[PDB]
Amino acid sequence: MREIVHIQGGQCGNQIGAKFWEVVSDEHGIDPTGTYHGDSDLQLERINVYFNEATGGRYVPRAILMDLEPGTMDSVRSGPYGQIFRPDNFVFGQTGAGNNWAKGHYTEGAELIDSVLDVVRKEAESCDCLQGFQVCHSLGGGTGSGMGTLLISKIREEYPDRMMLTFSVVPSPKVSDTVVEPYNATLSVHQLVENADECMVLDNEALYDICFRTLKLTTPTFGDLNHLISAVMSGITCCLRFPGQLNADLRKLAVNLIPFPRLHFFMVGFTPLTSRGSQQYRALTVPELTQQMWDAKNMMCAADPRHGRYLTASALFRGRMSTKEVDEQMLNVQNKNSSYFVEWIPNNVKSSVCDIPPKGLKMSATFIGNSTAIQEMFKRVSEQFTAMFRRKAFLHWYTGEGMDEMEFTEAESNMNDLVSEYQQYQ
């Protein structure tokens, strides 16, 4: 029916998506060789959203891997569920950006994104009625930020009346891998404010604290973080793949959650998330799900909403549940903590239910809250960017490649008006 193509950029995007296709294929019962082995008819009836039957029970994922280094692509086909992707979908450069956003947006982008667009165009016309596009990338890298950024701009110029998601991890001062993170973040977000339909703000700090306290893991490699992110992404699209009492497509959530067109950066959470010592001691009820859902520490972004107010919030529930519990729980969590919600919008929480849980659990949830606390992140990177730019450090790879001085001044100005308009609407 409605179809979503998948686009993974850079190293972070590629590895996030690899675990994503593994988890999804397990939900629909496709083995790593790409054949159907499920039992229920509910699994076979909605695999056209993410796959195409090739020949004789061969279901291939509708995904496009794109980056600038061969190591990532080889690491995809090596691991399991690596043999399911069509090899033509590996659009692929060779030289590399080197964490230089200009090289990802002006130097190397000019020779790859045309090739990327051919594969993307083929995957859009391969399906009938597009629901939207799904892009997983970072904001601190070069080949994920710049490459994915220019791709997003060109795509919105081609298919403008279609939805678009960008799952993006953002950098933070405590988890600081690259040195030019602020230059990449502020310019990348400057493009996201005018191109993306809605963006989902992620960051690595929150992922580390989820695996520290909630999951109580000892050695949380990147496989577990990608495992966490994949559960959230599968949750946002369960409504398209399984029937339920209250369905909510991507368009339904965006039109309902975004009160003003430029304010489309979200904070995400997921429930339930429990450690192996406490997976036995818990119950599975809607209120138990709700408090662990709205918890401050359980946000999958390191921006505490309790420093500000909620504008809108959304809940996507999965499993056999009673809709009265759904509605009364949203009403109670809004009445006790009444100051944390915006005032000139009553009933700031939209909720929906789907009748199919993730495999291995009786009942789960997914939270999408559009709060006003997100301006902290924009200031936290803006001051670092201004601190660097007022002495032109690290600028010659930017100005020597094609940027001028006015682009950084444009970035600050757009940065400053967005944090100012967040401040007004709060």
């Binding site: 001062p173 891998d177 030019v180 490699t221 601190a387 660097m388 010659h396 790879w397």
Partner: protein, 427 residues
């Protein structure tokens, strides 16, 4: 992706003898050149099962080259690669740059061209030289001049040996270092300093070797290079390339001088009684008791740092460890840079070579940082170079070769100008 490594001078090709030794012992190749795909960055395959390194040894004196022609690796190196002159520059920068250099560097160039042509995705070059001599200084700078005009956009990793402050073997080396830096400044993209007294102190204290020769020095240098190319050779949880250091570590096109260090340099006995984890090696990479250049970053301020991690290392603790470093106050970063780190983790541990004095360690860290303590060393060189230049000692040899008094004064004021440049960025 490929990178070729060129070696100039007595110290240069001796360093190569340890590097290619380490390489074949890591990729399981016998010294004759046959296995009993990741080797593609350094070795090209004949197609008959023989692997040949991407390297050219060249110098002006045939002594150090011809023991290599008859060691164990007689059959590993292609004969044309091992270039050799007929007579030495003899610790005379001008003699290596104008008299004898002008005949030998053109042969090296039309050789290095077909090494690059055999390559496909050339990442860059990386050069090895000691500035105290005449070959590594003179034709080294001449070779870098002609390399910049040929390629330009390709990285040129200069792993140079600067003369030690107090421990020195030659007497005209202050002249050679100043004139060489004058051109190493505007040609090398990323130039790493490797002193000799610092490596001497590491082998004395850490390796507890009280009688070290040049063999152990070259051994640990190869270890740092191996730790730096593992990200290019092998896959890790978080990798970087050689084009990453060009952007992430040098804020201005003339400030490219990095302090290197490595950890843990530990003997065979401490490892048995001691514990290895990520936090302590993240600490040990920063203390000045493990640096490779006699300077103190405690006197300077950091611009940006880089961290190679090898072995069984997860990414959660490298972040936690670098966080603990920033919250400490013994070392401080420049005001303009809020974030000053570039981290990287790779899966393969460092292999060991039999006969070396490096233990088999479970994990290791290779740190490459940039600071302003490097400004003190350059100033320290200027005092004793200017000390003798005014009275015109030893000038008659260089000017007799065909130079004049002009290039001393103009090279002197250029590096003097660099002193002022370092002081103004630190403020």
């Amino acid at each position: 992706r490929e990178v070729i490594s060129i070696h100039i001078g007595q110290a240069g090709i001796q360093v190569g003898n340890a590097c290619w030794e380490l390489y074949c012992l890591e990729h399981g190749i016998q010294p004759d050149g046959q296995m009993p795909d990741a080797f593609n960055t350094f070795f090209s395959e004949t197609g008959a099962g023989k692997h040949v390194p991407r390297c050219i040894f060249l110098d002006l004196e045939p002594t150090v080259v011809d023991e290599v022609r008859t060691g164990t690796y007689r059959q590993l190196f292609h004969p044309e690669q091992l270039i050799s002159g007929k007579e030495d520059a003899a610790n005379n920068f001008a003699r290596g740059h104008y008299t004898i250099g002008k005949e030998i560097v053109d042969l090296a160039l039309d050789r290095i061209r077909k090494l690059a042509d055999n390559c496909t995705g050339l990442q860059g070059f990386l050069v090895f030289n000691a500035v105290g001599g005449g070959t590594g200084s003179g034709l080294g700078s001449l070779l870098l001049e002609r390399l910049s005009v040929d390629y330009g956009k390709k990285s040129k990793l200069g792993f140079t040996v600067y003369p030690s402050p107090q421990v020195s073997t030659a007497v005209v080396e202050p002249y050679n270092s100043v004139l060489s830096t004058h051109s190493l400044l505007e040609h090398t993209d990323v130039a790493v300093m490797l002193d000799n007294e610092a490596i001497y102190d590491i082998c004395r204290r850490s390796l507890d070797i009280e009688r070290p020769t040049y063999t152990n020095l070259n051994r640990l240098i190869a270890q740092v290079i191996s730790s730096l190319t593992a990200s290019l050779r092998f896959d890790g949880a978080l990798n970087v390339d050689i084009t990453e250091f060009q952007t992430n570590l040098v804020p201005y096109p003339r400030i490219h001088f990095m302090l290197s260090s490595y950890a843990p340099i530990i003997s065979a006995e401490k490892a048995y009684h001691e514990q290895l984890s990520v936090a302590e090696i993240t600490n040990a990479a920063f203390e000045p008791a493990s640096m490779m250049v006699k300077c103190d970053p405690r006197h300077g301020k950091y611009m940006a740092c880089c961290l190679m991690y090898r072995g069984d290392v997860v990414p959660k603790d490298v972040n936690a460890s670098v966080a603990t470093i920033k919250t400490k106050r013994t070392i401080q970063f420049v005001d303009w840079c809020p974030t000053g780190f570039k981290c990287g983790i790779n899966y393969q541990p460092p292999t060991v070579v039999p006969g070396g004095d490096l233990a088999k360690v479970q994990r290791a860290v290779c740190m490459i940082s940039n600071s302003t303590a490097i400004g003190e060393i350059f100033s320290r060189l200027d005092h004793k170079f200017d000390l003798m230049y005014a009275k015109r000692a030893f000038v008659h040899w260089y000017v007799g070769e065909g130079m004049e008094e002009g290039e001393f004064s103009e090279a002197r004021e250029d590096l003097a100008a660099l002193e002022k440049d370092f002081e103004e960025v630190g403020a």
